[PDB]
Amino acid sequence: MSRSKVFFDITIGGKASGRIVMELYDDVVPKTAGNFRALCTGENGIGKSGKPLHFKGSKFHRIIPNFMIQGGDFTRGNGTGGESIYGEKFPDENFKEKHTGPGVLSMANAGPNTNGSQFFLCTVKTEWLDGKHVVFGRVVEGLDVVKAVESNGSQSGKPVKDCMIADCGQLK
């Protein structure tokens, strides 16, 4: 199909830090892009977990310098939770798009066919993830805000400060 545009308004340690605008690849990975889009708008409401199927208020719980920022765990907030709009986990749709550089938007997973709601924004080219994580979008504005979050990561993945998706939604 077409390409949806979505956003995150970010706070870092409670301070407004700008907006990340993303373009999704609806034409390439419609099922995967659709999940992400609906989790930006919150339009499928409460999920099987009893929590909102919505990125609003969740955090980037895992941030590794010179790698990527990862979020989407709005049920456990620690990497162990999350849920797609489809009901818990769904299969890898395709591997058409590759990890080419900073700004790349890709799904976190725990092995083949385990996509949920967790995702990462790459801060480098992560070509070693090609064929293992499904790429479904890219940042088109606010890459500076991605760098600001990145500066709060650690090798250990633990953030030094709460990096929060304070608002989010669909644009066009």
mmCIF file of C-alpha atoms in Angstrom:
data_model
loop_
_atom_site.group_PDB
_atom_site.id
_atom_site.type_symbol
_atom_site.label_atom_id
_atom_site.label_comp_id
_atom_site.label_asym_id
_atom_site.label_seq_id
_atom_site.Cartn_x
_atom_site.Cartn_y
_atom_site.Cartn_z
ATOM 1 C CA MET A 1 0.000 0.000 0.000
ATOM 2 C CA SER A 2 0.978 3.612 0.733
ATOM 3 C CA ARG A 3 3.223 4.821 3.540
ATOM 4 C CA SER A 4 1.881 5.959 6.878
ATOM 5 C CA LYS A 5 3.736 8.612 8.855
ATOM 6 C CA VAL A 6 3.803 8.316 12.626
ATOM 7 C CA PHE A 7 5.484 10.123 15.486
ATOM 8 C CA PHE A 8 6.858 9.971 19.001
ATOM 9 C CA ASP A 9 7.134 13.045 21.239
ATOM 10 C CA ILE A 10 9.997 12.287 23.575
ATOM 11 C CA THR A 11 10.827 13.258 27.118
ATOM 12 C CA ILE A 12 14.174 12.587 28.770
ATOM 13 C CA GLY A 13 14.130 12.580 32.522
ATOM 14 C CA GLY A 14 10.761 14.397 32.221
ATOM 15 C CA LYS A 15 12.070 17.057 29.854
ATOM 16 C CA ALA A 16 10.501 17.565 26.446
ATOM 17 C CA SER A 17 13.201 16.665 23.897
ATOM 18 C CA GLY A 18 11.474 16.864 20.513
ATOM 19 C CA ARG A 19 9.601 14.707 18.016
ATOM 20 C CA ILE A 20 10.751 11.637 16.058
ATOM 21 C CA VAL A 21 8.767 11.273 12.787
ATOM 22 C CA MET A 22 8.809 7.884 11.095
ATOM 23 C CA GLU A 23 7.765 6.657 7.669
ATOM 24 C CA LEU A 24 6.447 3.103 7.588
ATOM 25 C CA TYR A 25 6.767 0.685 4.689
ATOM 26 C CA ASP A 26 3.048 -0.282 4.292
ATOM 27 C CA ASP A 27 3.740 -1.170 0.678
ATOM 28 C CA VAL A 28 6.411 -3.718 1.639
ATOM 29 C CA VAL A 29 5.326 -5.154 4.998
ATOM 30 C CA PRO A 30 1.661 -4.233 5.389
ATOM 31 C CA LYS A 31 1.020 -6.524 8.382
ATOM 32 C CA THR A 32 4.093 -5.381 10.250
ATOM 33 C CA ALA A 33 3.656 -1.660 9.472
ATOM 34 C CA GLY A 34 -0.007 -1.915 10.399
ATOM 35 C CA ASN A 35 0.807 -3.277 13.859
ATOM 36 C CA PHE A 36 3.245 -0.427 14.502
ATOM 37 C CA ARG A 37 0.804 2.210 13.195
ATOM 38 C CA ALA A 38 -2.065 1.004 15.379
ATOM 39 C CA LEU A 39 0.238 0.873 18.410
ATOM 40 C CA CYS A 40 1.050 4.559 17.730
ATOM 41 C CA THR A 41 -2.640 5.575 17.632
ATOM 42 C CA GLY A 42 -3.766 3.149 20.389
ATOM 43 C CA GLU A 43 -6.878 2.429 18.241
ATOM 44 C CA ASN A 44 -7.153 -1.298 19.166
ATOM 45 C CA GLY A 45 -7.612 -0.377 22.817
ATOM 46 C CA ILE A 46 -6.952 -2.945 25.525
ATOM 47 C CA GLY A 47 -5.045 -6.096 24.556
ATOM 48 C CA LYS A 48 -5.151 -9.640 25.902
ATOM 49 C CA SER A 49 -2.760 -8.508 28.649
ATOM 50 C CA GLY A 50 -5.285 -6.039 30.064
ATOM 51 C CA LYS A 51 -3.029 -3.089 29.189
ATOM 52 C CA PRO A 52 -3.418 -0.589 26.376
ATOM 53 C CA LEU A 53 -2.077 -1.612 22.971
ATOM 54 C CA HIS A 54 -0.374 1.777 22.820
ATOM 55 C CA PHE A 55 3.202 3.093 22.892
ATOM 56 C CA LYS A 56 2.097 6.229 24.788
ATOM 57 C CA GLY A 57 3.702 6.418 28.229
ATOM 58 C CA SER A 58 6.112 3.545 27.562
ATOM 59 C CA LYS A 59 9.902 3.916 27.642
ATOM 60 C CA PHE A 60 13.015 2.999 25.760
ATOM 61 C CA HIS A 61 14.004 0.334 28.304
ATOM 62 C CA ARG A 62 17.139 -0.807 26.434
ATOM 63 C CA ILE A 63 19.559 1.676 24.882
ATOM 64 C CA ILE A 64 23.043 0.605 23.702
ATOM 65 C CA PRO A 65 25.464 3.233 22.390
ATOM 66 C CA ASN A 66 26.526 2.788 18.750
ATOM 67 C CA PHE A 67 23.832 0.169 18.218
ATOM 68 C CA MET A 68 20.195 1.080 18.738
ATOM 69 C CA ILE A 69 17.394 2.211 20.987
ATOM 70 C CA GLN A 70 14.667 -0.313 21.819
ATOM 71 C CA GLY A 71 11.143 0.075 23.195
ATOM 72 C CA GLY A 72 7.599 -1.214 22.832
ATOM 73 C CA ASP A 73 7.317 -3.136 26.086
ATOM 74 C CA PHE A 74 4.172 -1.484 27.388
ATOM 75 C CA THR A 75 3.220 -4.495 29.481
ATOM 76 C CA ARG A 76 6.344 -5.335 31.519
ATOM 77 C CA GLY A 77 8.588 -2.394 30.597
ATOM 78 C CA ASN A 78 11.698 -4.557 30.794
ATOM 79 C CA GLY A 79 12.098 -6.486 27.565
ATOM 80 C CA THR A 80 10.069 -9.470 28.695
ATOM 81 C CA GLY A 81 6.646 -8.191 27.649
ATOM 82 C CA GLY A 82 4.825 -6.364 24.880
ATOM 83 C CA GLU A 83 1.991 -7.612 22.643
ATOM 84 C CA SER A 84 1.117 -7.083 18.986
ATOM 85 C CA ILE A 85 -2.364 -5.977 17.996
ATOM 86 C CA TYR A 86 -2.765 -9.522 16.617
ATOM 87 C CA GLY A 87 -2.852 -11.061 20.030
ATOM 88 C CA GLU A 88 0.657 -11.840 21.264
ATOM 89 C CA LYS A 89 3.186 -12.954 18.570
ATOM 90 C CA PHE A 90 3.151 -13.054 14.753
ATOM 91 C CA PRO A 91 5.508 -14.392 12.054
ATOM 92 C CA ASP A 92 8.196 -12.634 10.115
ATOM 93 C CA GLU A 93 6.358 -11.119 7.126
ATOM 94 C CA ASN A 94 9.433 -10.796 4.891
ATOM 95 C CA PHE A 95 13.058 -9.607 4.929
ATOM 96 C CA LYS A 96 12.881 -7.416 1.828
ATOM 97 C CA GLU A 97 14.143 -4.301 3.597
ATOM 98 C CA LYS A 98 17.629 -4.251 5.088
ATOM 99 C CA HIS A 99 19.396 -2.594 8.002
ATOM 100 C CA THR A 100 21.220 0.127 6.097
ATOM 101 C CA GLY A 101 22.144 2.814 8.653
ATOM 102 C CA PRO A 102 20.914 5.056 11.468
ATOM 103 C CA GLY A 103 17.145 5.718 11.528
ATOM 104 C CA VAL A 104 16.226 2.191 10.417
ATOM 105 C CA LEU A 105 13.082 0.950 12.195
ATOM 106 C CA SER A 106 13.001 -2.806 12.873
ATOM 107 C CA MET A 107 11.206 -5.379 15.044
ATOM 108 C CA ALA A 108 12.761 -6.824 18.168
ATOM 109 C CA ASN A 109 12.162 -10.583 18.523
ATOM 110 C CA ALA A 110 13.236 -13.733 20.368
ATOM 111 C CA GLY A 111 13.999 -15.962 17.377
ATOM 112 C CA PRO A 112 12.058 -16.703 14.170
ATOM 113 C CA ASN A 113 8.438 -15.655 14.029
ATOM 114 C CA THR A 114 8.187 -13.984 17.468
ATOM 115 C CA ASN A 115 7.249 -10.381 16.657
ATOM 116 C CA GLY A 116 5.237 -8.626 19.384
ATOM 117 C CA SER A 117 5.269 -4.845 20.028
ATOM 118 C CA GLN A 118 8.968 -4.361 20.814
ATOM 119 C CA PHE A 119 10.966 -2.574 18.138
ATOM 120 C CA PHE A 120 14.282 -0.764 17.764
ATOM 121 C CA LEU A 121 15.565 2.356 16.077
ATOM 122 C CA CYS A 122 19.105 1.792 14.782
ATOM 123 C CA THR A 123 21.790 4.343 15.492
ATOM 124 C CA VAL A 124 24.253 2.596 13.163
ATOM 125 C CA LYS A 125 24.167 0.255 10.156
ATOM 126 C CA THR A 126 23.393 -3.114 11.716
ATOM 127 C CA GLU A 127 23.764 -5.297 8.596
ATOM 128 C CA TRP A 128 24.342 -8.362 10.764
ATOM 129 C CA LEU A 129 20.619 -8.310 11.595
ATOM 130 C CA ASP A 130 19.588 -8.690 7.936
ATOM 131 C CA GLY A 131 17.280 -11.684 7.473
ATOM 132 C CA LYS A 132 16.693 -12.018 11.193
ATOM 133 C CA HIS A 133 14.742 -8.906 12.141
ATOM 134 C CA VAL A 134 12.026 -7.482 9.955
ATOM 135 C CA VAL A 135 12.656 -3.907 8.798
ATOM 136 C CA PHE A 136 9.463 -1.915 8.318
ATOM 137 C CA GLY A 137 10.273 1.782 8.344
ATOM 138 C CA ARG A 138 12.760 4.580 8.875
ATOM 139 C CA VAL A 139 13.098 7.879 10.748
ATOM 140 C CA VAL A 140 12.524 10.872 8.410
ATOM 141 C CA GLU A 141 12.601 13.689 11.000
ATOM 142 C CA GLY A 142 14.082 14.070 14.494
ATOM 143 C CA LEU A 143 17.201 11.914 14.073
ATOM 144 C CA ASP A 144 18.757 14.383 16.535
ATOM 145 C CA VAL A 145 16.162 13.293 19.118
ATOM 146 C CA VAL A 146 17.223 9.681 18.489
ATOM 147 C CA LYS A 147 20.843 10.714 19.242
ATOM 148 C CA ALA A 148 19.747 12.446 22.461
ATOM 149 C CA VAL A 149 18.101 9.235 23.688
ATOM 150 C CA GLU A 150 21.158 7.270 22.558
ATOM 151 C CA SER A 151 23.388 9.423 24.744
ATOM 152 C CA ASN A 152 21.495 8.083 27.764
ATOM 153 C CA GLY A 153 22.187 4.401 26.961
ATOM 154 C CA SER A 154 24.956 2.213 28.345
ATOM 155 C CA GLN A 155 26.912 -0.836 27.099
ATOM 156 C CA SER A 156 24.813 -2.743 29.623
ATOM 157 C CA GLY A 157 21.603 -1.504 27.897
ATOM 158 C CA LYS A 158 20.339 0.189 31.061
ATOM 159 C CA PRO A 159 19.386 3.847 30.455
ATOM 160 C CA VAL A 160 20.840 6.479 32.727
ATOM 161 C CA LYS A 161 17.567 8.444 32.576
ATOM 162 C CA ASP A 162 13.918 7.650 31.727
ATOM 163 C CA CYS A 163 13.488 8.101 27.972
ATOM 164 C CA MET A 164 9.759 8.166 27.518
ATOM 165 C CA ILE A 165 7.342 8.170 24.595
ATOM 166 C CA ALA A 166 5.269 10.960 26.143
ATOM 167 C CA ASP A 167 2.934 11.241 23.161
ATOM 168 C CA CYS A 168 2.558 9.440 19.853
ATOM 169 C CA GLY A 169 0.190 9.086 16.952
ATOM 170 C CA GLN A 170 -0.371 9.124 13.207
ATOM 171 C CA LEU A 171 0.177 12.071 10.879
ATOM 172 C CA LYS A 172 -0.473 11.106 7.239
#
